[PDB]
Amino acid sequence: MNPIILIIILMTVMLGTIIVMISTHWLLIWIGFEMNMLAIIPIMMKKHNPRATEASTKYFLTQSTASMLLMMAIIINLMFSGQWTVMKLFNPMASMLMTMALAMKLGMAPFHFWVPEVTQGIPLSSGLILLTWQKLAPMSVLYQILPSINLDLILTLSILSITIGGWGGLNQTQLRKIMAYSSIAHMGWMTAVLLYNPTMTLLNLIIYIIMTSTMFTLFMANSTTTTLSLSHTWNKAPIMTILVLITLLSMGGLPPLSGFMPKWMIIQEMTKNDSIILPTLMAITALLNLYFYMRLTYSTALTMFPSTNNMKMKWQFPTTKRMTLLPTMTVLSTMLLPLTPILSILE
Amino acid sequence: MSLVYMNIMMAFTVSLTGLLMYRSHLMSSLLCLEGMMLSLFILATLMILNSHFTLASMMPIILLVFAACEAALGLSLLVMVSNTYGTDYVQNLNLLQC
Amino acid sequence: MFMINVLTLIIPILLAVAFLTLVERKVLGYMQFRKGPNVVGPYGLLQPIADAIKLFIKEPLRPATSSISMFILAPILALTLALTMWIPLPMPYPLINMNLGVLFMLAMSSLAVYSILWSGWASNSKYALIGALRAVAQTISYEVTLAIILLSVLLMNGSFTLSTLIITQEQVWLIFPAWPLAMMWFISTLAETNRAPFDLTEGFNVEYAAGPFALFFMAEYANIIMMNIFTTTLFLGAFHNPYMPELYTINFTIKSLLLSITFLWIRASYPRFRYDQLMHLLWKNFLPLTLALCMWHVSLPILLSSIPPQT
Amino acid sequence: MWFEVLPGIAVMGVCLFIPGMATARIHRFSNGGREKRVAHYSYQWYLMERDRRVSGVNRYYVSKGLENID
Amino acid sequence: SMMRWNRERRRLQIEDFEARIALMPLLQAEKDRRVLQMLRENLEEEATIMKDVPGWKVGESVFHTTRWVTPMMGELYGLRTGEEILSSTYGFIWYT
Amino acid sequence: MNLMITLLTNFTLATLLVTIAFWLPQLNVYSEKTSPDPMGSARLPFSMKFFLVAITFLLFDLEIALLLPLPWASQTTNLNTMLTMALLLIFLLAVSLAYEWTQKGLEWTE
Amino acid sequence: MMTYIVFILSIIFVMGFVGFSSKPSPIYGGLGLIVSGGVGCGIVLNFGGSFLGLMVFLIYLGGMMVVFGYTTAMATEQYPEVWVSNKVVLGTFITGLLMEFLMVYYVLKDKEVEIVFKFNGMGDWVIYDTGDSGFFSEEAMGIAALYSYGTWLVIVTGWSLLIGVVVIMEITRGN
Amino acid sequence: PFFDVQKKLGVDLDHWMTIQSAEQPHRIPARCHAFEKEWIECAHGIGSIRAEKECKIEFEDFRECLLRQKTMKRLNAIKRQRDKLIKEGKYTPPPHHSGQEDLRP
Amino acid sequence: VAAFLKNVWAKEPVLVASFAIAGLAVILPTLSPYTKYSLMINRATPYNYPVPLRDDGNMPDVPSHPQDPQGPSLEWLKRL
Amino acid sequence: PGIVELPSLEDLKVQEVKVSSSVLKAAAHHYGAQCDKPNKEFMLCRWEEKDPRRCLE
């Protein structure tokens, strides 16, 4: 791809998300989602292989269905309110449609069935964009319409997302599908605390983006796409070996790491509102995420080691790859928990 | 609510059910998706002309243009699929199971 | 009384299309140093009637159609869109006086490629389908400059009303401030109807019989006469006295005949373009000039304070 | 010679002259010897329906002048 | 030539619009008496139709406010014949 | 109303001429003929160039759809903004054309 | 009968989507969507939305569905159908379309008038000609205001169309 | 994340299309200009929670101006009673609703 | 910048004509004196009703009859 | 709600101007010149009261 065209397309992705973030009008919300999808479609097809075309086709179908459902919710709002302010919705039918459409754009279960496929089909930097930058616009719309979001529907989608993102991580050797099911589980975590404290929604979002960006940056630094290919990291770059795995111990949700910062705070906002059963169940399912991801941790820092002889040649060449913000993002994804009351900046 | 709006919503849900039960082709998916876009155009237009809300009359054209550009993108995706397999069949799009 | 008016539009259209074949064969005769038909009737005046009765009892080819419905709906759509382009044409007062007759005609001519596409898919041939796809690509290519030239000219009109276009040109012809738009419009209407030198179909609907081919043929010639009349109204607009409308009717009739014979005189003068050469003519020659003149005819009534009235 | 094309051109010219002459005569026949009222806009239609109501015979083209006021 | 003639046509458009402006008080007064005539007729025929139905305030508004509401097409032409309804609601749209 | 009557009469005349064109030579008992072109049994290969010119038509047609209310927008009071946005739309149509040029998009149907 | 015409078109509009949401073929799917676009355009035009109906014809139907039929015709390899003499090749078409209009007239039955007559819209629904507007279509001036009032809207729309051109030319390259 | 850039910088990017009561071209009113203006002036600045329960009368007047469901219900009731009385033969229509009265202006 | 212009006028006169017409369409509405009259005519075209004002007592610039001296006059448009 | 107070039929009767629209358009500019004062007092009452029931007389 032409690098000027790459810069223009990435600024158009950022522009579409910014237009969703700054607009007081529903048509510009829809326009920003359309611009974001239209610009991110060549990011997936950076390598021009059939798996990227299949991934982009599935992504187009799901995001286009979500865009049309979003426009139907906007149209029903214009029926029952005659106006266009991005605020609470004035029909629970339009509220249910916009909640379903934003759950489709986030890939929350039971609309999760495109997230492990598309992330498998595309490269690691485009999967990084799909799992970090593309969450920002529908979570912003959910932040702006929460006086109309149905409680039972968002809790159903949240716990179903956490359970399915939990039980998706068993049978996988692909690093990208494991990041996709971790995405689904964390979106269930974010939308669990949305109608109780959306500051914890933004805290969970920022900690999730920092941990996901650290993990994809490590995957790009080592050029490893599977568990078995990740297993050779100890012999090539031994400093790369543990940083992946303390970041993934963070991504499970485990003290004293900063990935324990969102979930605890989420529980800290749901025991206030007299829900004791629901954060208990959701964080037991987070322990199930710890179960499978700790099995992957055992895979890399321990037993299944053995190397091949061509690795000896890689010892005579350093990484000339840009590991952009990787020490910064690795420090910010583990050691941030003693600065947990920084979250007041997200009000 | 009203009657002709209920008819346009009924068409939207019928093309949604056609968009949610795939038979053979990807072009059928794109056609049901653009029937959904058509029903959104019709229903937005009848609301905007009903209330005599003047500045929103540019809105369905906007709702056309972007989404028609969206359809162009979808057509190009179909073409690349049909350049790999020879057909636009959705069952050729199953390599991402693993 | 209105149905009488619809019949007195549509029957003389078909008679004029019937005798356009005679005018074409005679004028192409004398331009090719030969005579045209003069044996059948007196000076050939029964040649269209004989040709029509021949084509309408000729055997159907028993066509191996890929579909029944598109095979029937392509001549139906061709004739319906051939006739409905005439109803907003001001002669000096149209059959259907509508506020958006220009946009109506642009829409109904943009719908006219489905007859080509359905005739192409309704044939079993892959070669006929390739020729139909090439023809559809050509026609939708030249519809772009139809729309932009038409918009640029109607920036001097005030609105999309075709009867207002007579009021616009009461002092001067609109070919004087818009002759580059006129010449590119004229070549673009020449390239719409697959008329020479843009006739690569004779260089798609041969699956049909001779009768349905006569239907596509007469729809194509009704489009030729209609676009000549629309160009006459659009650039060479005649004088109109509201107490004697026959002055305007005879005047635009004479100008429309001269412009249709100008089509007949172009087709007996030039070789055909190659296909990529007329795609080069559109996308690399007519489209930059057409966009620049669109910018020019936007910004020119603003700088000359000659913005036309809305009503 | 070249004037042999003129009967066909004349027939085609009469065939193009008939629709415009026909619709002009029908507009003068159906509207009281005058042009058909053009209502492209709501004000023109409002004045037209006001004419249809003040004429008393459900016909807009019957003009009531100063004889209808005292 | 188009400069001089478009400027003259703009002056003619302003002349026609000033004719409209000079006529709008009479047309507005006749429109007011038109709609009040039709609403008084609908009120009286409503009062002579709705006798057997209990709990029916004749002329009861559906708006809780007392501000004048611009009457809908059915508040005026509801109890009339179908051809007048067609000429009222599709007359301008279907006009040639 | 008159428009719907005119469309219905044009459709009726079209269907009548098609019906006469099919049923009038099928009075004949001519011959039932047998034994069914530049390809005999070849499949259709796809061509990328025809699809490129179709999508180019669609995108410039959307840009024309934006350009269509200009004879009405000339009548507005904010003519400086209107002129800037009209020139900006036609300039973006020209930039789309120049990008279609320089990336060899207009080649072999130029 | 003539009063309920928009409603009648809406019923046909719904039936039009059942023409192609059942998906008999992408080509007949395009044909059903063209017929549905025409009748939904009739619904739009019968509220005084003349420019928006002509955008349905010029941009949705003649602009985009041409491209859908064009891309469909460059796929889905064809095969012949029944081609007997005129008692099959046009007679079955006419009987099938007469049964289609029989299906259109067949749904206006006792299960329909309980919804039509209890919720009578025609008489009080189509209210676009409620009073006078003046010397201008309000819908035309609202679309005209895209250039004076809609500066940001035109900027993001033209930028999305330029990015659409760039995105199509990048993904349709294969290199 | 609602980064209100339009209030920070002082630009009007999309506030003008938002409500019906904004500055329309050629001062065209909406059908419900007064009702939406009263709902906006009632519910202004007090927040959504107080705006739901403390401006319900103006909001229901505006919703009934939009949908006209109570007015269509009332007209269906009166027209149904009129049809039943014409069917029973206990009522006759007036001349000014049958079309023999030579309309006002 | 001049031999290049003669070269591009020799090779590609269509694009030279297009860029010249587009450049003039850009620059000439600002270099013109008659551009302000477009603005003045479009803001003096009365699409609405000129709603009168209640006379509070001290408004010298507002007339009482259309045939009064004060008020916005279109002598410039009639004369030009 | 309250009963909407519609005025009687006798409070609406007036001697109409029963002329056609071309009679009014031919006589438009002199009508705007000579019938200025009651027309503008009426339309001022009509835009201030926002109610034709108080704009009858």
Ligand SMILES: CCCCCCCCCCCCCCCCCC(=O)OC[C@H](COP(=O)([O-])OCC[N+](C)(C)C)OC(=O)CCCCCCCCCCCCCCCCC
């Ligand atoms: C409306 C009534 C009719 C109108 C007139 C039309 C009737 C005459 C018809 C004649 C017969 C036509 C036969 C078919 C024609 C097809 C071939 C053809 O001609 O193709 C078009 C040809 C194509 O040229 P070409 O094909 O030779 O070019 C070769 C191109 N390269 C080198 C890239 C391979 O010409 C054009 O495209 C020009 C179109 C008209 C341009 C008008 C410009 C006006 C002046 C602008 C300003 C210029 C100066 C700069 C600024 C100065 C400021 C002071």
Ligand SMILES: CCCCCCCCCCCCCCCCCC(=O)OC[C@H](COP(=O)(O)OCCN)OC(=O)CCCCCCCCCCCCCCCCC
């Ligand atoms: C209230 C909060 C509001 C929101 C706050 C801000 C949210 C920020 C979300 C950031 C999401 C970033 C997604 C990735 C960057 C986008 C562009 C991109 O992908 O650049 C990577 C670039 C691509 O290079 P390429 O050549 O394509 O590499 C592939 C192999 N050839 O180069 C590479 O691949 C090199 C490898 C390293 C790339 C590292 C990129 C990290 C970017 C994110 C940093 C962390 C997030 C920001 C700070 C915290 C805020 C949440």
Ligand SMILES: CCCCCCCCCCCCCCCCCC(=O)OC[C@H](COP(=O)(O)OCCN)OC(=O)CCCCCCCCCCCCCCCCC
């Ligand atoms: C395969 C099927 C068969 C194929 C052949 C037949 C169909 C295709 C060819 C015909 C196409 C039909 C087009 C019908 C609408 C045309 C647009 C139109 O109505 O424009 C005219 C006018 C707008 O102008 P304006 O002056 O503003 O209106 C009066 C305002 N005072 O607006 C008016 O005057 C409005 C008049 C009333 C509304 C007319 C509605 C017509 C019926 C609905 C559509 C019918 C066609 C459906 C199928 C289409 C398939 C392409």
Ligand SMILES: CCCCCCCCCCCCCCCCCC(=O)OC[C@H](COP(=O)(O)OCCN)OC(=O)CCCCCCCCCCCCCCCCC
């Ligand atoms: C708006 C303008 C439209 C104009 C359209 C018409 C253009 C053409 C104008 C007329 C041209 C001449 C027509 C006559 C041609 C010659 C016919 C003729 O006489 O043929 C002779 C033939 C043999 O008969 P026989 O008696 O054996 O001859 C031996 C001599 N004793 O005997 C026969 O052939 C038998 C007699 C047949 C006569 C047919 C005459 C032509 C019919 C035309 C019908 C349409 C006319 C226009 C209708 C609409 C306007 C009213």
Ligand SMILES: CCCCCCCCCCCCCCCCCC(=O)OC[C@H](COP(=O)(O)OCCN)OC(=O)CCCCCCCCCCCCCCCCC
């Ligand atoms: C600022 C005003 C607004 C400008 C934007 C609106 C413009 C309207 C027209 C839009 C045209 C869109 C397409 C333009 C593509 C330009 C690039 C190009 O065509 O380069 C190739 C060409 C060489 O020709 P070749 O490659 O051989 O052509 C194939 C057939 N033989 O290379 C060339 O032929 C060179 C073409 C570029 C240089 C032309 C210079 C013209 C100068 C005219 C006088 C000054 C005008 C003032 C503005 C400056 C413009 C540069």
